[PDB]
Design a protein around this ligand. Structure first.
Ligand SMILES: Cc1cc2nc3c(=O)[nH]c(=O)nc-3n(C[C@H](O)[C@H](O)[C@H](O)COP(=O)(O)O)c2cc1C
Ligand SMILES: Cc1cc2nc3c(=O)[nH]c(=O)nc-3n(C[C@H](O)[C@H](O)[C@H](O)COP(=O)(O)O)c2cc1C
Ligand SMILES: Cc1cc2nc3c(=O)[nH]c(=O)nc-3n(C[C@H](O)[C@H](O)[C@H](O)COP(=O)(O)O)c2cc1C
Ligand SMILES: Cc1cc2nc3c(=O)[nH]c(=O)nc-3n(C[C@H](O)[C@H](O)[C@H](O)COP(=O)(O)O)c2cc1C
Lengths: 359, 359, 359, 359
């Protein structure tokens, strides 16, 4: 019996091959930020109000004007079919059951179209990478619009891939039967048919395909390109958050890319308040990185995030029992968040306030 | 030979069945506050005065106008007959011998009447839960008044039960021969005859019986209902402490419910000063959570608590040697507190002052 | 080959019987201050000056107007003959060889007279306890004066003995052949012929013989009683240090009694600056507790101590090789202190200054 | 496959004899500063800018007016031929391949002339010790000038050698076939033919040969003696840095001598900002001590260092695979630094700024 999210990782290591487990598990380099994403949540202490009447705790909220069952949503984990045969399609179906949203990776092992077909009524957004080939980028955006995706989350922190040490020791790359389904060429589909040498296959993929020259000029282009809400994912500084708002973007996702890019950046829960402050109420702010418990969700919302995204636990759900496993992980987090809300005097998400936390 | 309180827990694990040991031992979720309740006491350092004449250290004080032999009293540990056949009755008899007070749990395995009969001359108070059925709540209050109980400690931090992970893995519930003796129905007596499913039997008990809508309106009701002193137990915030005083309550018990409710709240010794300050001398403040040593008692009193309550060590005393074991735990704490008082220059509790501590 | 002080303790445990090792090793209760006496020194960082000309580093200084070879002196460890047959006499002879001073315990296993005879030219002071019998106290002071002892260090932090847990488990008491040689009665000589029951023999000794009523009135008495310099040993507070100066005392020894009295007091190196400040240049301040390295000595002197005292390492020297072992421990500390002085730009003790340290 | 610098040390211990490994590995005394040199880098957190266009990250910079391929240079590790037969000559050839500079130890197992011959086009500087014999010191300076060395790094923190405990237990000294090649006498060449007794052979070497009277007067002499740039190596205080600038020196190398001199000084990354501030833009500041990763290099440069020096990793490269091993260590650091620069929004070293870091 798996009763908490920690239980799931424990189990996922027992079933996945090392290369696939290490890929999902890893942080960059010495993994300092990886540990900190978790340890940081513990440092923020909770100050619950008593006797507030919490009989019918309502977890419902909205992300970018769309209703969700809870401020807990699925983040864009790449290449989910390595964890479960059903991959991204199991994930979207779980999201459809939960009433929450799924961010789909540009590097998904299932296509934008496939995912919409498996979860037609699920809230779905696209995580976008900016490709050297702008026609490829445009195509992803257009396909997301066509298929009823409700926003673009542009990743802005990966001009190159971080150095995850296990992926290089393991010579990481997709199993022979799998591809990045959003692309048609061998190169852009991350075909395991290539010999990538003595390094991570993903680091090479990105170096070849993804544009390190990415700048605010590209943000201007993207903003003119789509009328969809656009969220900047990977922002860690207040002055960059200000710049995003100025470029007409509609949200910031505070993220250190699951501790997999630049190591030694702060925990997301630690930078969240500076971003919420920099944005001056203009745009919704979200958080990912280290969320494992309902109290983590409470802390991020007290500090001003609208919603949080869940990365690794989703993969671990997938690896345990596919769709049901993702559904169960999401239901564990939901009921932990409900209990934490109620114990802190919060009937609904609107009465969550920052007096609930102190560092 | 058991010579300190730590010795007792060590021993209690060796004799109790796992389910019963885990139930008493547990904190909520990842048990962060559990560890912190203890670690926090160590961070407050002592600044003893020398050459003060401490030849006849007097430990005597008062709780809510009633005299006690020492500012160390027994907190409301539920279902004591799981640790020792004599349960709550061994406890009250030890309290009678010591000259200190016992708070009786609403969820005791011995009745309010039984306990008064076993300790007629012992100082006794009732820890109250607010039940969905107000007639049940009223009955407990009336029975406490009838039986010579001298105050009501209302718990205000349990609209639902915290999630203690071991209790759910163990499917915790009372052994077949035991009940919550204050109640007559199967439901309200926590009859182990029920099949509680794949979770804690206690979490279900509370969800069914205990009113999550509890508010300050219920506090107003309770205050009109009894002329007994009422103490708010579970308060962790200064603004809530202020509210209690305003509702005409007679004390605050600073408690995080032994780290078993909302995890990630501060240690009680850490919030104590903010509560003492919020209350502005109007009402007595007590503390529970993490008290294991005489120096813990000294620290809480220097910071302004009138008295402290002892939870788990009492159960561990019970589990070692019943009445004698509880008596011995209380005598260990008494002599540790006496030694700590004397070494710090304090002849009596009235000259304990806050210059004795700094964080 | 033993080349540092840590090496000596390591070895002492291998040769001493457990009861004797535990007695010397122990702190009070959970031993928090014990660990902190050491860990605290590490937190103070050194800021060495370069290019100062340190060719002939002079370690010489003075304690209470008497010259010493180095600001490193022997503290009053009780009952040294438990570690080595030669006990206190080996110690004084080592001190005589080094040119530094020895503080003799009131609870020495060698008499005030014996020690003066074995080290006639050694600088010697008496550590005094105030006995219930004032004639006994007077006698110790008079014998120290008669025998060429140059100061009285009155201990002010032991109205009762701290609770050292191992001493109670071990039923600590002197081996059959040994006594506290400064006394003639069975009681006052700590005769092991007595059955002390289920506790520390030393805790009983003190409870029976040593006056818990000790106050500033007794300090006034002692000051009128002898024209010897008097130092208050055990002071941890600035307001008490002020009081000592006002009573006409000639020094303060910042001490938490080797972490063996009240546990949870600060490290001595941490309180030292507040005492140096409280004393306003009027009197010399010394430090004991946790000194194991030459850099510890440097730190205490930068913070304003005139000299430091060494407790446990002396016993460990005694236990390794008697007189030679104490001499070697003292020579290790001397050369470590010389090296640390030179590396920090300090030719002599007078140019040691507080810019050398920051916490 | 060795893919990070940590991998190299791990391997070096497996191949080197203990005495040689311990000598290179060691810090002074309890090795507190040793651990801290590393742990300190982790405490400084990175605040990367996004969307800055980092397509052609240029690592090129200059040290003291000479161009280097990257702000990462080789520090003056003594006696390299103990790690590899080719010693300093393998090192200079690797530096020649990399386009970066090598600081040559006064205590090199290869001569100033030998090194220039093996790396004629490599940027080379001399690390100078001030000898009791000033003719010896003058000779080293003159030989460096003659041989195309481009600066003098005078070490100012070794009036005596630190106490490295393993070197004394091991009776450290050069293997029979090796000498300090810059000297002709037995004494000054550190001939292993001598019996050095029961201590470090290097501590004796320094005590006999190196002048503990070193002062600012000697700095004045050295400044008049050569027109080469002079850098003060070993400075840890702002007031000393000020003094260096005043004596007409051309740089400061912030160093605690790899934690091998005075233990308990701060980490170099921690003192760096105070030195950069004390120097008021007048002179370039460098850092050594604890550099193992590209992010360490980024942090030192954000805090105002022009370049950093690498000590132990070079020896570990040497011990793994001689020239190729040193080259590979330097290439690992280069590509880690490039990745870290790019991920933080930095196209070139000139846009590295201090907003990138906070402690
Ligand atoms: C296996 C894995 C794959 C990921 N793939 C992507 C990706 O394709 N695009 C992206 O923007 N972020 C990616 N991320 C970062 C996540 O969107 C998210 O920030 C992170 O997983 C959240 O932290 P958590 O894993 O601790 O819950 C990935 C993270 C992991 C662990
Ligand atoms: C086994 C156990 C049962 C408890 N039962 C109750 C209860 O019935 N009602 C209540 O208000 N608090 C209850 N508490 C919380 C205690 O009143 C008290 O706050 C806590 O035990 C004090 O901390 P300590 O256990 O570290 O000494 C319980 C705690 C434990 C460990
Ligand atoms: C075995 C032992 C015996 C001691 N006996 C005495 C004593 O008789 N009188 C006294 O004032 N302090 C006594 N002390 C405290 C010391 O004077 C001193 O404060 C302490 O040993 C210094 O700390 P250190 O042991 O870490 O070096 C004793 C300490 C030890 C460890
Ligand atoms: C084996 C070894 C030998 C060293 N020899 C010298 C030396 O001869 N002269 C000098 O000024 N510093 C010497 N140092 C200190 C280095 O120049 C440098 O400050 C240090 O190695 C940098 O720290 P790192 O080893 O952590 O990279 C030595 C350090 C080591 C580890």
């Amino acid at each position: 019996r798996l009763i908490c999210i920690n239980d799931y990782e424990q189990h996922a290591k027992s079933v996945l091959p090392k290369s696939i487990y290490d890929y999902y598990r890893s942080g960059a380099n010495d993994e300092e930020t990886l540990a900190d994403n978790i340890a940081a949540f513990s440092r923020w202490k909770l100050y619950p109000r008593m006797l507030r009447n919490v009989a019918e705790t309502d977890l419902s909220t909205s992300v970018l004007g769309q209703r969700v069952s809870m401020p807990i949503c699925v983040g864009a984990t790449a290449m989910q079919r390595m964890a479960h045969v059903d991959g991204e399609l199991a994930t979207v179906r779980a999201c459809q059951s939960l009433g929450t949203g799924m961010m789909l990776s540009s590097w998904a092992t299932s296509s934008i179209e496939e995912v919409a077909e498996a979860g037609p009524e699920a809230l779905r957004w696209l995580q976008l990478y900016i490709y050297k080939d702008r026609e490829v980028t445009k195509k992803l955006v257009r396909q997301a619009e066509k298929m009823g995706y409700k926003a673009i989350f542009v990743t802005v922190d990966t001009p190159y891939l971080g150095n995850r040490l296990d992926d290089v020791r393991n010579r990481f790359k997709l199993p022979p039967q799998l591809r990045m389904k959003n692309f048609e060429t061998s190169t852009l589909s991350f075909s395991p048919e290539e010999n990538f040498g003595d390094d991570s296959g993903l680091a090479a993929y990105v170096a070849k395909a993804i544009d390190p020259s990415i700048s605010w000029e590209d943000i201007k282009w993207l903003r003119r390109l789509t009328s969809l809400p656009i969220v900047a994912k990977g922002i860690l500084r207040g002055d960059d958050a200000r710049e995003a708002v100025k470029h007409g973007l509609n949200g910031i996702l505070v993220s250190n890319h699951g501790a997999r890019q630049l190591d030694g950046v702060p925990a997301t829960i630690d930078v969240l308040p500076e971003i919420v402050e920099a944005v001056e109420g203009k745009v919704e702010v979200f958080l990912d990185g280290g969320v494992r418990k309902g109290t983590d969700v409470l802390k991020a919302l007290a500090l001003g995030a609208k919603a949080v995204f869940v990365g690794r636990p989703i993969v671990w759900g997938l690896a345990f029992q596919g769709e049901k496993g993702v559904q169960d992980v999401l239901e564990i987090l939901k009921e932990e968040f409900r209990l934490a809300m109620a114990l802190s005097g919060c009937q609904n998400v609107k009465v969550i306030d920052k007096t609930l936390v102190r560092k």
